[PDB]
Each structure stands twice: as structure tokens, then as C-alpha cells.
């Protein structure tokens, strides 16, 4: 059992990266590990996507602790290059945060992946 806790399979990972692009399009996703920690402190992060191929796993392993503190679930992607590509940016992001907004038309999708993610945890 490595420190790399929940890491999804191929199809699940695909679909969260697709909600990643749609939330980045609707400005519902924030970028960076330090910014993810910031919105964790803010209490507006609704869930967290993180990487697995970073330098090293620890600088983003600091986030699951605050996740279990502020009951905000999280999961891992295998490729941070893929995570930055679904973020839609030239540089590989390693940690991104889905926020909260009540007037969002994709909220059923986010609550759907919330069900699937909680059954994964």
C-alpha cells in the first residue's frame, strides 16, 4: 500500500479530467497546490484533483490531510502533464481544485462524480 491513495482507473480518470475542462471553461476550477491549500482554508473547494508523478508525492500529499480535516474528498491522476492539459495550460499543473457555485449548470455532473468519488473512498 503506497502513499498514493485513491488513484482512479482509466475511464474514471478520463471523466474527471472532462469535468476539469468544463469547470475551467466555466471558471469553476482553481490551479496550483498552494492555491488548493488556500481554498481549503477558504472552505469553498468542493473537491481536489492531484497528481502522482510530481517532484515528489509529498508536496501534494500535504493536501489529503486537510481534506480529511475539512471533509472535502480528493483523488489522484497518474500524469500531471495530463492534468495541466485538462487544465488547459502550457505548464503541467500537479494540483487543481473544483470550487462551489450554486448557479452552475454542471452541478449535477459534479454531484454525480461526488457520488462516484465517495463510493471510491
Amino acid at each position: 500500500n503506497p502513499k498514493a491513495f485513491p488513484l482512479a482507473d482509466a475511464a474514471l480518470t478520463q471523466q474527471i479530467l472532462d469535468v476539469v475542462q468544463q469547470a475551467a471553461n466555466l471558471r469553476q476550477l482553481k490551479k496550483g497546490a498552494n492555491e488548493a491549500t488556500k481554498t481549503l482554508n477558504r472552505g469553498i473547494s468542493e473537491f481536489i484533483i492531484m497528481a502522482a508523478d510530481c517532484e515528489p508525492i509529498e508536496i501534494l500529499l500535504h493536501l489529503p490531510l486537510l481534506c480529511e480535516d475539512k471533509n472535502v474528498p480528493y483523488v489522484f491522476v497518474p500524469s500531471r502533464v495530463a492534468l495541466g492539459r485538462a487544465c488547459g495550460v502550457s505548464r503541467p499543473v500537479i494540483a487543481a481544485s473544483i470550487t462551489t457555485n450554486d448557479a452552475s449548470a454542471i452541478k449535477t455532473q459534479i454531484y454525480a462524480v461526488k457520488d462516484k468519488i465517495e463510493t471510491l473512498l
Binding site: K3, Q14, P56
Partner: protein, 467 residues
């Protein structure tokens, strides 16, 4: 003195050449050559040189250039017409000078001569943009700055040999002369997110189709310098484009994972989706390893009037016909899986067993994305390329239901950006030059910087055919 007499005279010279070439191959077939001209004018896959190639002796030559982050390259090959008989090239001093036009993220377009297949591509001329083409208004429809000012991305030479169009992240389409590289016109996209992604001239015509980043595609008239049409329907960015001699235009969008076959004759479109299921693939394998779900489809080459190939990001290469909604032949990991990262870098802890535990075995392996993918027109062969430095050429079967790997070429190093094929020689013997603009970064975003020995330049592979 009469044009019909002159046409007949050119036909007489044509048939004289045909019969002398027939005598040469001898040391029926003439009408077969005529039917070959008609198939060139319109036909299905007829160029069947998928077995005459000699890939093991294919001479490789990498060419490092000073400019950094090459984005695209466009080869102009002048061909002799069938209806008229002068040329497809415009000038007399050209006489079929094989041209190359490379655009690089240093805002530089460069024309090369590639007229010889043994020598190196010669840097004929160039034109570089800069920040003096930064526009003054920054908030209007007017983007008529004569040079580019931000992140050129794609290029396309017109088939008449008169003009070359360029588009990039400065939401402009500047068309230039091919000799002086003078901006003969510039078309603004009149958009905030209308950035140029990929261009497509209709074969043997000026009808240029521009896949654009605002989820729309613009088709242009080049001789009159205007925008004919815009077509909408992409749920994601209109990432890549491909076109042929007729009024069909295939465009791939990445994150909806969709292949749109746009039909200009109706103004309408047709759809294509994949949908390989890993649980079904694994249960089928149990009826018989890894199964990578499709993240993004990124590249298309329309190989025929009825068939096209699509390279995706998770290693899949899908061949498609117009009859079925499904891919008629999907293909698993093409350039292999990416090599696994290192334990010390993934963990940063002196415990080596915990390091390999963080390496996790199989759960961190990813495949190579098929970065570029080019098909020889109306032929039975096609080429794909990734940042593996392994350019992989395959051939499709005669029944058009499968493709098999012809071979690999290792002269290129890094992210191959754009591939083009130039055929030359007589009718019997054909020499093929496979040129590939290749950089260290992807054209859209960086996403990677450490590829060992990746160089900015062009790789040339010259092969012959014999059989």
C-alpha cells in the same frame, strides 16, 4: 494558332512521352496511364506502392536549425496538370522547385529548397515577426498588422504556387507572396478567442479551410482574399483538420473526442465517435494486460473519399470508413508506453522499497501520444510520429479493414510536429522524401521540457520504391 490545335499538340507530345515510356518499361498500359490520370482527378485509394518500399535502406538526415520550437511545415510539390499541360507552378525559373515553408514559435517563417533528395534543405528565405506588430487598439475587429506579433502556429501553401497563408495565436491569417515573403493580405478573425489552430487547402484549389480555436472553422477564398464560410458544431476546440480534392473536410475535437466530417455540398456534417470500453476489452482478453481509455483524439488524415485515420492521445490509432459510425479498425498502443519515472524522483526518501512502492508497478504507466500523423494522398500507406523519436510507417490492406506496420525510422529526436511526403521521379521509379518539422515542445502548450537530445529542426528520410 488555334487553341484546340494547341491542346491537341500538347496531347500529341503527351502521348509521345507515354509511348516512349512504355517502350522504356518494355525494355493497354498507355490507356491504363490515362485511367490513372482520371483516378488522380477523382478516385479511391489507388496508389498501391505499399510493397515496393525499401525501408531498411531509407537514408536518414536530421537538420538542426537555429530557430526554436518549430510548429508546422508545408511542402509545395508542383505537379503537371491533366486538363491543361503547363504546370501547377507559376513562374518559369521555378520549373518545379520543391519548396518547404516552416513556421516556428520564434515568430519565424522560413522557405527552403528541397529539390534534391541527397543534399540538405537549403534555407532560401525567411521572414520574422516581432513586438512592433503589436496592434495599437487591442479591442477592435482590426488586426491588420502586416507581421505576426504572437505565437505563429500553422502554415499552408496555396496549390497554385503563388501564396502562403500563416495563422497563429495572434488571431490573424496573414497570406504572403512565396518569393519575397511580403504580406499580400491579412485577415483578422474578428474574435477574442478566434485563434488559428490548423489549416487545410482543398487539394488542387485555393479553397482553404482553417480549423480555429473558437469552436468554429473558417473556409476562405484566397484569390479574392476573403472569408467564404464559417461552420459551427464543435463542442471542444477544433483541434486538427484534413482535406482532399473534393468538398469534404474532417476536423477533430479533442475533449469531446469527436471526428466531424464536414460536407460543404450540403453545408452539413457527419459525426464519428469512438468509445472503446476497458472492461469489455479485458473480458475479451480473458476470453482470449493494460487498456488505456481514450483521453483525446488529436490528429486526422483523410486518406480517401470514404476513409480516414485518427491518432488519439492514449496510443489509439483508429481507421474509419464513411459506412460505419464505429472505427472500422482501432489500434492499441502505437509508440509503446512512456518509460516509467524514477523512484528517487517520485519519492524523495532514502527508503528504496518505499520508493519502488511509490513507483507502484503498473498503475503509473502511460502511453505515447501520436503527435503527428500524415497520409500520402490516395495511397495505401500512412505515417505516424510521437516524441519517442520513432517515426512509424504503416500500410492499410486492400479491403481497407486493417493496417500493418511497415517500419520504424530513428533519425528524428523529440516531438515531431509536422510530417509531409514529396514524391519525385518518373512514372515507374518514385523517390519519396519524408520531411518532419520536429521540436522539443508541443505546438499548443509546452507540457514537457526534458526530452533527451530533442532538437529544433527537420528530419528528412529519403526512400526509393522497387518491385
Amino acid at each position: 494558332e488555334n487553341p484546340a490545335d494547341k491542346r491537341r499538340r500538347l496531347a500529341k507530345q503527351y502521348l509521345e512521352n507515354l509511348k516512349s515510356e512504355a517502350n522504356d518499361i518494355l525494355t493497354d498500359i498507355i490507356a491504363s496511364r490515362l485511367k490513372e490520370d482520371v483516378a488522380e482527378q477523382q478516385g479511391r485509394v489507388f496508389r498501391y506502392f505499399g510493397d515496393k518500399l525499401l525501408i531498411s535502406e531509407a537514408k536518414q538526415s536530421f537538420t538542426r536549425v537555429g530557430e526554436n520550437n518549430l510548429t508546422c511545415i508545408s511542402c509545395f510539390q508542383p505537379v503537371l496538370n491533366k486538363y491543361t499541360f503547363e504546370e501547377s507552378s507559376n513562374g518559369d525559373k521555378n520549373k518545379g522547385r520543391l519548396f518547404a515553408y516552416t513556421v516556428s514559435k520564434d515568430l519565424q517563417l522560413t522557405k527552403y529548397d528541397i529539390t534534391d533528395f541527397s543534399k540538405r534543405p537549403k534555407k532560401l528565405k525567411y521572414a520574422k515577426g516581432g513586438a512592433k506588430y503589436i496592434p495599437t487598439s487591442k479591442h477592435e475587429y482590426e488586426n491588420t498588422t502586416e507581421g505576426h506579433y504572437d505565437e505563429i502556429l500553422t502554415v499552408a501553401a496555396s496549390p497554385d504556387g503563388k501564396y502562403v497563408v500563416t495563422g497563429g495565436r495572434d488571431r490573424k491569417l496573414i497570406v504572403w507572396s512565396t518569393e519575397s515573403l511580403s504580406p499580400v493580405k491579412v485577415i483578422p478573425t474578428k474574435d477574442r478567442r478566434g485563434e488559428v489552430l490548423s489549416l487545410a487547402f482543398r487539394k488542387n484549389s485555393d479553397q482553404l479551410y482553417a480549423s480555429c480555436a473558437d469552436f468554429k472553422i473558417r473556409t476562405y477564398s484566397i484569390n479574392q482574399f476573403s472569408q467564404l464560410e464559417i461552420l459551427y458544431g464543435h463542442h471542444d476546440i477544433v483541434e486538427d483538420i484534413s482535406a482532399l480534392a473534393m468538398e469534404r473536410c474532417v476536423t477533430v475535437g479533442a475533449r469531446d473526442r469527436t471526428a466531424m466530417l464536414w460536407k460543404i455540398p450540403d453545408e452539413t456534417r457527419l459525426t464519428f465517435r469512438g468509445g472503446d470500453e476497458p472492461q469489455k476489452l479485458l473480458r475479451r482478453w480473458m476470453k482470449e494486460p493494460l487498456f488505456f481509455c481514450e483521453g483525446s483524439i488529436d490528429v486526422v488524415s483523410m486518406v480517401d473519399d470514404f476513409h480516414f485515420i485518427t491518432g488519439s492521445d492514449n496510443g489509439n490509432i483508429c481507421l474509419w470508413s464513411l459506412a460505419k459510425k464505429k472505427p472500422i479498425f482501432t489500434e492499441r498502443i502505437a509508440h509503446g508506453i512512456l518509460p516509467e519515472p524514477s523512484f528517487n524522483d517520485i519519492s524523495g526518501e532514502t527508503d528504496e522499497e518505499l520508493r519502488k512502492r511509490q513507483l507502484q508497478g503498473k498503475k503509473l504507466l502511460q502511453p505515447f501520444w501520436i503527435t503527428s500523423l500524415y497520409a500520402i494522398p490516395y495511397s495505401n500507406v500512412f505515417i505516424s510520429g510521437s516524441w519517442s523519436g520513432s517515426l512509424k510507417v504503416w500500410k492499410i490492406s486492400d479491403n481497407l479493414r486493417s493496417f500493418e506496420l511497415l517500419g520504424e525510422l530513428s533519425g528524428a529526436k523529440g516531438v515531431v510536429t509536422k510530417i509531409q511526403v514529396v514524391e519525385s521521379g518518373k512514372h515507374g521509379k518514385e523517390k519519396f522524401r519524408i520531411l518532419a518539422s520536429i521540436a522539443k515542445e508541443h505546438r499548443l502548450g509546452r507540457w514537457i521540457a526534458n526530452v533527451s537530445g530533442a532538437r529544433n529542426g527537420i528530419y528528412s528520410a529519403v526512400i526509393d520504391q522497387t518491385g
